[PDB]
Tab-separated table of N, CA and C in Angstrom:
chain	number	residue	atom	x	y	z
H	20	UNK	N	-84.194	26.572	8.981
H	20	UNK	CA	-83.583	26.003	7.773
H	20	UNK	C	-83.302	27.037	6.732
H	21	UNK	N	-82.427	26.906	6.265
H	21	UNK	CA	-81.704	28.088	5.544
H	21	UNK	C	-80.768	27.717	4.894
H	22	UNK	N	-80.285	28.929	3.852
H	22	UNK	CA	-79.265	28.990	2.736
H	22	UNK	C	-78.460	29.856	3.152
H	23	UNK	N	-77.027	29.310	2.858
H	23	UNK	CA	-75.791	30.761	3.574
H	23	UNK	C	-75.217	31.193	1.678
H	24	UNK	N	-75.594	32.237	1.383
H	24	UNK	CA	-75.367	33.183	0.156
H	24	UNK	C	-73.877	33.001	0.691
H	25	UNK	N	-72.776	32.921	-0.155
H	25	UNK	CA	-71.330	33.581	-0.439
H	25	UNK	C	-71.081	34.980	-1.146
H	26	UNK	N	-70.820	36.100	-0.131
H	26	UNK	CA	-71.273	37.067	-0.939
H	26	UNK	C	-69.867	36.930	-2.196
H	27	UNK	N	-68.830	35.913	-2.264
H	27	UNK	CA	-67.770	36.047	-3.240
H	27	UNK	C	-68.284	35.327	-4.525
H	28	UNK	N	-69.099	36.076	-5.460
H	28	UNK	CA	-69.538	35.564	-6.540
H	28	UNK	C	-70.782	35.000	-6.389
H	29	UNK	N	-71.350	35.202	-5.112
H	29	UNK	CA	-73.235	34.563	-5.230
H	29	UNK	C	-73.712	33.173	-5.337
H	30	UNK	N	-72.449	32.000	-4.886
H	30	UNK	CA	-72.473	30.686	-4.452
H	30	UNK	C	-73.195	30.142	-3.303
H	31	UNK	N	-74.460	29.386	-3.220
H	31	UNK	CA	-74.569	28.852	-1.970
H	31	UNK	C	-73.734	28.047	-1.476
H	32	UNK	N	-73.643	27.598	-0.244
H	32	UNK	CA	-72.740	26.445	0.136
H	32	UNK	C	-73.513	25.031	0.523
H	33	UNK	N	-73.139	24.108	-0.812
H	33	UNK	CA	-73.615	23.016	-0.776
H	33	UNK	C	-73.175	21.578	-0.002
H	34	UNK	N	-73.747	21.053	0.459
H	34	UNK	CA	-73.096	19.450	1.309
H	34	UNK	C	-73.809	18.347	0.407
H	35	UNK	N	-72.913	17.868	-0.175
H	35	UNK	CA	-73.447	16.447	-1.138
H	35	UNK	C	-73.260	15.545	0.227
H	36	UNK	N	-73.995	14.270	-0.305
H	36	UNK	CA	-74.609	13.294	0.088
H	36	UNK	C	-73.186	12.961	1.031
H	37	UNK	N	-72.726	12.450	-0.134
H	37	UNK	CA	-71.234	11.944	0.178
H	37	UNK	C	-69.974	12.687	1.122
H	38	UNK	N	-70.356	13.706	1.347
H	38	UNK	CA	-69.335	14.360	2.145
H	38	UNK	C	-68.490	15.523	1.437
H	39	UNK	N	-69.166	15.490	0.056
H	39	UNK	CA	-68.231	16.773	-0.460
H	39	UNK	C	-68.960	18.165	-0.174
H	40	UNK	N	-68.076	19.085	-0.421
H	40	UNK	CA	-68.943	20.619	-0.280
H	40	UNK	C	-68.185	21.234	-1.279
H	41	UNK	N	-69.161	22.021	-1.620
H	41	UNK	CA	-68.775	22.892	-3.168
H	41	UNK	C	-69.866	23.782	-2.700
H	42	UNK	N	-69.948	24.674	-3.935
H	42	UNK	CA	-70.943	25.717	-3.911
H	42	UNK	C	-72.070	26.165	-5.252
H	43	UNK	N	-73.055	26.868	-5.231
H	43	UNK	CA	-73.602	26.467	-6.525
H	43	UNK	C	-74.640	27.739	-6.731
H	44	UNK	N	-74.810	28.014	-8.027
H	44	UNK	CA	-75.994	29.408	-7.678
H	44	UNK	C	-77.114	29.265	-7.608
H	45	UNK	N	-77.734	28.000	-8.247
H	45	UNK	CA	-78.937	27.452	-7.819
H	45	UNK	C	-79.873	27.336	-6.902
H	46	UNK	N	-80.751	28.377	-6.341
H	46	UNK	CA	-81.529	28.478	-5.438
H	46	UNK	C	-82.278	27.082	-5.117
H	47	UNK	N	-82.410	26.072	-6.303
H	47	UNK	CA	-83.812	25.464	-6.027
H	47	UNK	C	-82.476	24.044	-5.937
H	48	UNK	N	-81.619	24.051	-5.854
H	48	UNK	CA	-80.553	22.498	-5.261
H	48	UNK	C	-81.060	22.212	-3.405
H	49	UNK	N	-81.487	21.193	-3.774
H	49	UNK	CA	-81.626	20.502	-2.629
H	49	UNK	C	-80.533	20.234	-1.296
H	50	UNK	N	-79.509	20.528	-1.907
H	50	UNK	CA	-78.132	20.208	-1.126
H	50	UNK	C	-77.786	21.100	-0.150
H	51	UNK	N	-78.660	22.482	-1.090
H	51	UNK	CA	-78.510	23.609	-0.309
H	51	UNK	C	-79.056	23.958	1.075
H	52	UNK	N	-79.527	23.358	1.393
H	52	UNK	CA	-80.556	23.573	2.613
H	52	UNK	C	-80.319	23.045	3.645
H	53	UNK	N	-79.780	24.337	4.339
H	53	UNK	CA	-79.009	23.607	6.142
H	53	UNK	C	-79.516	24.180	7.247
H	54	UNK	N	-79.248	23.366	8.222
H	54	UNK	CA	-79.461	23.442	9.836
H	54	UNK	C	-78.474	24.386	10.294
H	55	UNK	N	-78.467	25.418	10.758
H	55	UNK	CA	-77.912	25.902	11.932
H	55	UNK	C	-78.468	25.648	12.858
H	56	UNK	N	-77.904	25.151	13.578
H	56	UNK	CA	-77.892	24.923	15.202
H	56	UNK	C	-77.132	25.611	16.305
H	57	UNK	N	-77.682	26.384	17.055
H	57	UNK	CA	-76.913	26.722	18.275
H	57	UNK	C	-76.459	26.364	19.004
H	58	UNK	N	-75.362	25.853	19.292
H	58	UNK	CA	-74.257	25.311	20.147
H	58	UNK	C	-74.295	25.501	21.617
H	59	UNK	N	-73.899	27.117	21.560
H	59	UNK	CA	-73.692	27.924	22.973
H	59	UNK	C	-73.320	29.266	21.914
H	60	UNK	N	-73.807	29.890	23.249
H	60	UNK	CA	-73.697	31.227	22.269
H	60	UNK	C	-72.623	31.788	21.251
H	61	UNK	N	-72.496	32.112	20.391
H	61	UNK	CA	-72.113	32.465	19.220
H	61	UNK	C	-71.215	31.551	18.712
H	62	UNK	N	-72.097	30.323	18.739
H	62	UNK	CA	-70.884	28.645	18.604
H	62	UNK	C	-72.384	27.885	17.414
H	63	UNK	N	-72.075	27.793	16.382
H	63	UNK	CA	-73.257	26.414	15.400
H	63	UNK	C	-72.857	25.498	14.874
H	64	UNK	N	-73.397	24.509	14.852
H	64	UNK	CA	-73.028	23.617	13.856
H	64	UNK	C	-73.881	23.480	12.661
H	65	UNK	N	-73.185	23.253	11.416
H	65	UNK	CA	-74.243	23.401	10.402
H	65	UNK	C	-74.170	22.082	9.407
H	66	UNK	N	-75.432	21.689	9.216
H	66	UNK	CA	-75.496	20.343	8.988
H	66	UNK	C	-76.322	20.560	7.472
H	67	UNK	N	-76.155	19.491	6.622
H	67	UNK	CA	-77.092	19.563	5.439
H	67	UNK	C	-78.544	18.603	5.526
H	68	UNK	N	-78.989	18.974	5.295
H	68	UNK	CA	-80.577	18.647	5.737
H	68	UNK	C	-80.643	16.846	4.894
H	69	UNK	N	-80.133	17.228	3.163
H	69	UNK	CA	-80.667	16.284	2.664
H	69	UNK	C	-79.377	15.387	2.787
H	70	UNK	N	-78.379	15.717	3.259
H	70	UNK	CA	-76.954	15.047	3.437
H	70	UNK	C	-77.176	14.424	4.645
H	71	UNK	N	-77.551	14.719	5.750
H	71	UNK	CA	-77.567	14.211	7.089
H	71	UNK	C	-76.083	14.241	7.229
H	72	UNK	N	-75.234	15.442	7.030
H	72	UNK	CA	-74.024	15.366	7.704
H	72	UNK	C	-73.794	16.850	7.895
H	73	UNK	N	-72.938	16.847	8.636
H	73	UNK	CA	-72.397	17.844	9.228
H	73	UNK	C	-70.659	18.817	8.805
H	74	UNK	N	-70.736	20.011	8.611
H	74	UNK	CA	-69.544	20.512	7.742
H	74	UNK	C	-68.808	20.254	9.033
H	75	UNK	N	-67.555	20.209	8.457
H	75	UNK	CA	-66.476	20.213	9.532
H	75	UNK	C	-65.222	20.377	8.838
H	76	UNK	N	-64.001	21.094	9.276
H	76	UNK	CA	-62.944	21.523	9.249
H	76	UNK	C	-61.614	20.867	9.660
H	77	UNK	N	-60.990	20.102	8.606
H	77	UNK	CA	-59.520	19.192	8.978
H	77	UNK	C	-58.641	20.148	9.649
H	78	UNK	N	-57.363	19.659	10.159
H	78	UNK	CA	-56.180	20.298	10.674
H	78	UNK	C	-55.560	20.865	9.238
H	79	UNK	N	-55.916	20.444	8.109
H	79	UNK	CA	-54.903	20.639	7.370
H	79	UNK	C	-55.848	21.660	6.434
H	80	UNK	N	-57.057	22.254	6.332
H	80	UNK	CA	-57.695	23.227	5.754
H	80	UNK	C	-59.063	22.716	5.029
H	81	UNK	N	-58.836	21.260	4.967
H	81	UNK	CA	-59.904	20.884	4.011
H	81	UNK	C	-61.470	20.903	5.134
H	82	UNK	N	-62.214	21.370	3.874
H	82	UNK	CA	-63.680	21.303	4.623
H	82	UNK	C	-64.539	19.982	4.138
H	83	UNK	N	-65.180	19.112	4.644
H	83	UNK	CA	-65.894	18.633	4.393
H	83	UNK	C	-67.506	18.061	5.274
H	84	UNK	N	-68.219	17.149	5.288
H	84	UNK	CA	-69.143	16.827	5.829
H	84	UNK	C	-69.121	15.444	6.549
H	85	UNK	N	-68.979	15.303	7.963
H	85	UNK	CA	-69.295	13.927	8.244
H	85	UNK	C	-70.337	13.388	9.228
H	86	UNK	N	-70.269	12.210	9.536
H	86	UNK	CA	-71.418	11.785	9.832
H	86	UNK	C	-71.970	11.941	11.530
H	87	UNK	N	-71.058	12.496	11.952
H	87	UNK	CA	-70.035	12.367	13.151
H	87	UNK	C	-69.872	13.908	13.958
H	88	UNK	N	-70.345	13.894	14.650
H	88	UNK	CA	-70.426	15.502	15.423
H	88	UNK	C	-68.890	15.458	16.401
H	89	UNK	N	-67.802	15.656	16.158
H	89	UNK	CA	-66.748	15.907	16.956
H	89	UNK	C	-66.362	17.394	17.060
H	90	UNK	N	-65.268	17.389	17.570
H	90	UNK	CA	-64.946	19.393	18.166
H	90	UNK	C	-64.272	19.742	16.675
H	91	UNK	N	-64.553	19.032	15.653
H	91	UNK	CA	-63.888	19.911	14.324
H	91	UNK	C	-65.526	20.321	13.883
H	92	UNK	N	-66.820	20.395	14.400
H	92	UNK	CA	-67.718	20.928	13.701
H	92	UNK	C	-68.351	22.034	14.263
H	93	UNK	N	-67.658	22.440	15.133
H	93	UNK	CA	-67.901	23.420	15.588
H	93	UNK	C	-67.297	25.227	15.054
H	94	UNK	N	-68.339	26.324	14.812
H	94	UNK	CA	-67.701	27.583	13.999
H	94	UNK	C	-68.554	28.533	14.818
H	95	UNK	N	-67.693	29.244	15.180
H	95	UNK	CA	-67.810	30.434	16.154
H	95	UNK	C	-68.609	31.269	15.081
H	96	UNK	N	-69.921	31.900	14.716
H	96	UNK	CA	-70.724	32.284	13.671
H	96	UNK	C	-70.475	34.062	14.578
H	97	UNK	N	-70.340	35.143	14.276
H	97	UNK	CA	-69.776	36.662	13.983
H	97	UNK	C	-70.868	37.597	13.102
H	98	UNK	N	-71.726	38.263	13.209
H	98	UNK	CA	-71.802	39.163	12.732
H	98	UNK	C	-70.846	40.474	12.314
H	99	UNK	N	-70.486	40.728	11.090
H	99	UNK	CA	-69.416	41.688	10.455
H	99	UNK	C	-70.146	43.123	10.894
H	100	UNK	N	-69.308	43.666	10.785
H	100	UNK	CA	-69.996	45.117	10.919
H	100	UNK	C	-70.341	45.322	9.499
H	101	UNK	N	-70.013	44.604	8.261
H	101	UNK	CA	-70.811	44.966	7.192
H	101	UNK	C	-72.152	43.978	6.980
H	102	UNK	N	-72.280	43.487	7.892
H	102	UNK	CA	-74.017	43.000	8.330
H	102	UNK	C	-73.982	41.490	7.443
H	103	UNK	N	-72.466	40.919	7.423
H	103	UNK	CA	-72.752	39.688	6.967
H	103	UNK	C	-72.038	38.901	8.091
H	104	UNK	N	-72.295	37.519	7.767
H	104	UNK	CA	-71.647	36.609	8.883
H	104	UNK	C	-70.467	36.002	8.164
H	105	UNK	N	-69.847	35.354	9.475
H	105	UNK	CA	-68.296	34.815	9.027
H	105	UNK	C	-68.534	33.484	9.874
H	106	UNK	N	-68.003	32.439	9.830
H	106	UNK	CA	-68.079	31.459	10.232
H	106	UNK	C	-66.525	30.495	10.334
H	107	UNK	N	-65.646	31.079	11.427
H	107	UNK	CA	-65.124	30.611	12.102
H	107	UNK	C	-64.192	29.258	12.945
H	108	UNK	N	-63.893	28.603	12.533
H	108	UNK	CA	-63.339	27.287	13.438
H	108	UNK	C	-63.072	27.314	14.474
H	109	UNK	N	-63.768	26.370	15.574
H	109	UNK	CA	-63.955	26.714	16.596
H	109	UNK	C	-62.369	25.724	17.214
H	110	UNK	N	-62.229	24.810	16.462
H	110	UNK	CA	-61.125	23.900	17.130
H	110	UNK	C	-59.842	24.624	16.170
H	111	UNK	N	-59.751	25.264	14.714
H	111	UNK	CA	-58.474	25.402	13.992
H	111	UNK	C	-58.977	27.408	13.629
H	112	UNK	N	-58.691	27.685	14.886
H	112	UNK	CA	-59.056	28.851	15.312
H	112	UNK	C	-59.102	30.315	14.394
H	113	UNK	N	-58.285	30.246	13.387
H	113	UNK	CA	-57.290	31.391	12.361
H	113	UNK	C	-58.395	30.960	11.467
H	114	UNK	N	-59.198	29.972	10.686
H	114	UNK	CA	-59.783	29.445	9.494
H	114	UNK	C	-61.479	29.436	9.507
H	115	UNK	N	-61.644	29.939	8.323
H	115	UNK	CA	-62.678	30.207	7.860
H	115	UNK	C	-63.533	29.591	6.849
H	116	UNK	N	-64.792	29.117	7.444
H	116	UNK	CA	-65.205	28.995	6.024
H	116	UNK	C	-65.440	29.694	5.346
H	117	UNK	N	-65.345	29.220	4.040
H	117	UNK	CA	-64.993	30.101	2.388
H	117	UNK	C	-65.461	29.583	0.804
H	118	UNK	N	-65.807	30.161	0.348
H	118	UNK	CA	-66.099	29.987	-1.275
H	118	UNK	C	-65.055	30.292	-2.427
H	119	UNK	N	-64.634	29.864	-3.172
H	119	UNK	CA	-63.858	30.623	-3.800
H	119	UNK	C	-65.279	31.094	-5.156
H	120	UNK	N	-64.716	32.070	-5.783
H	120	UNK	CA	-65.465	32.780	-7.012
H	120	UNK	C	-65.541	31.677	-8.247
H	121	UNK	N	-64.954	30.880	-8.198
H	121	UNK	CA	-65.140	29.458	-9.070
H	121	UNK	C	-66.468	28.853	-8.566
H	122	UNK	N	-66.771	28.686	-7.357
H	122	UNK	CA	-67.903	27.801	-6.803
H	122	UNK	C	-66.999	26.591	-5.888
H	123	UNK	N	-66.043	26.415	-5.878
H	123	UNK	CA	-64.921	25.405	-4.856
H	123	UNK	C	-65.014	26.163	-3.772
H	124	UNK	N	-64.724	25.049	-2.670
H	124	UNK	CA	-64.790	26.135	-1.395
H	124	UNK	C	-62.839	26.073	-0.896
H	125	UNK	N	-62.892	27.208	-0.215
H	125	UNK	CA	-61.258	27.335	-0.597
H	125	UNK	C	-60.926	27.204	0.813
H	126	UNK	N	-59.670	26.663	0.765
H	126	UNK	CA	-58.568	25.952	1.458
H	126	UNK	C	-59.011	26.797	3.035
H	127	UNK	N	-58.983	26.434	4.399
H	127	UNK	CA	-58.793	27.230	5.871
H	127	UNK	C	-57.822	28.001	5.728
H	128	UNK	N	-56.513	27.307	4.967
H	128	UNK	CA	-55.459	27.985	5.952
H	128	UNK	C	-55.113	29.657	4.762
H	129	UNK	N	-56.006	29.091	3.703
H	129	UNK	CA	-55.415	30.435	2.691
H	129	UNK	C	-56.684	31.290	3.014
H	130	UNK	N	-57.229	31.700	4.494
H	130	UNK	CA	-58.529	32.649	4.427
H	130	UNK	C	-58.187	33.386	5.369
H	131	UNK	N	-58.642	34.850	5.633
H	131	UNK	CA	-58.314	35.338	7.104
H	131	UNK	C	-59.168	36.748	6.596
H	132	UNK	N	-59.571	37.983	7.512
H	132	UNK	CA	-60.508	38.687	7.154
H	132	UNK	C	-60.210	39.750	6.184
H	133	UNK	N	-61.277	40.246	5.453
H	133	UNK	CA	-61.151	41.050	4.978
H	133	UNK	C	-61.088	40.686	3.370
H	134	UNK	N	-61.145	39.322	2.831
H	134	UNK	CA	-61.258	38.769	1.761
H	134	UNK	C	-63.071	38.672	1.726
H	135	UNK	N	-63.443	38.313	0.293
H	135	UNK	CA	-65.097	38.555	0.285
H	135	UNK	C	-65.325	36.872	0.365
H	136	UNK	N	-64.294	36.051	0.212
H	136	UNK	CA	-64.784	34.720	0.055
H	136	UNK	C	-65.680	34.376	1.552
H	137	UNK	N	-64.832	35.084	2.347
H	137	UNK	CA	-65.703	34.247	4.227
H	137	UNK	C	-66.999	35.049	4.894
H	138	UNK	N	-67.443	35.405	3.774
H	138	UNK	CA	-68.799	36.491	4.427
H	138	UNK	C	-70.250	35.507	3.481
H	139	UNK	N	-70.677	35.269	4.293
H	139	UNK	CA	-71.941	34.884	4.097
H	139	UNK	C	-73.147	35.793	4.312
H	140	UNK	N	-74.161	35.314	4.321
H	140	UNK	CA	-75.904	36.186	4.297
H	140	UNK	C	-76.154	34.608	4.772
H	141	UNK	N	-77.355	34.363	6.019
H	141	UNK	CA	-78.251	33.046	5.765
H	141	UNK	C	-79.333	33.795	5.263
H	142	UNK	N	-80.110	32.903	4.845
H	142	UNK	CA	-81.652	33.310	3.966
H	142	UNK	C	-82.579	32.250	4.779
H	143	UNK	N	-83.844	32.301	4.256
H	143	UNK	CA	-84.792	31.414	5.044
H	143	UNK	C	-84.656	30.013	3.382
């Protein structure tokens, strides 16, 4: 159980109850605290503990959480050679999850590498 740091501005990535995801700097938010799960190798799904849902990735960029484990919750998880992780769409292949420096998490289709929004850290 763990926290994924955004290294773009120092946002965790949060899953409300309801299915939204945002991000927040608050170490001690409850929202913050997720499951990675191993899939198959370098495949997770990541779920919010106090949400009981699962992030997942539309066709059209939006991220959110549902209740519902289908092939949009799946993210090919990457170690960077700058020793952070990236997290991947495993079904909308090009898209990333992302933070923007506001604390919003930003759009799939406006992410691709080399931006600081799609690099994470997990923490314990």
């Amino acid at each position: 159980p763990k926290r994924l740091y955004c290294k773009n501005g120092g946002f965790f990535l949060r899953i409300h109850p309801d299915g939204r995801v945002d991000g927040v700097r608050e170490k001690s938010d409850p929202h913050i605290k997720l499951q990675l799960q191993a899939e198959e190798r370098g495949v997770v799904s990541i779920k919010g503990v106090c949400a009981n849902r699962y992030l997942a990735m539309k066709e059209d960029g939006r991220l959110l959480a549902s209740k519902c484990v289908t092939d949009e919750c799946f993210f090919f998880e990457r170690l960077e050679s700058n020793n952070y992780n990236t997290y991947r769409s495993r079904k909308y292949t090009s898209w990333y999850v992302a933070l923007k420096r506001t604390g919003q998490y930003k759009l799939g289709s406006k992410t691709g590498p080399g931006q600081k929004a799609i690099l994470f850290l997990p923490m314990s």
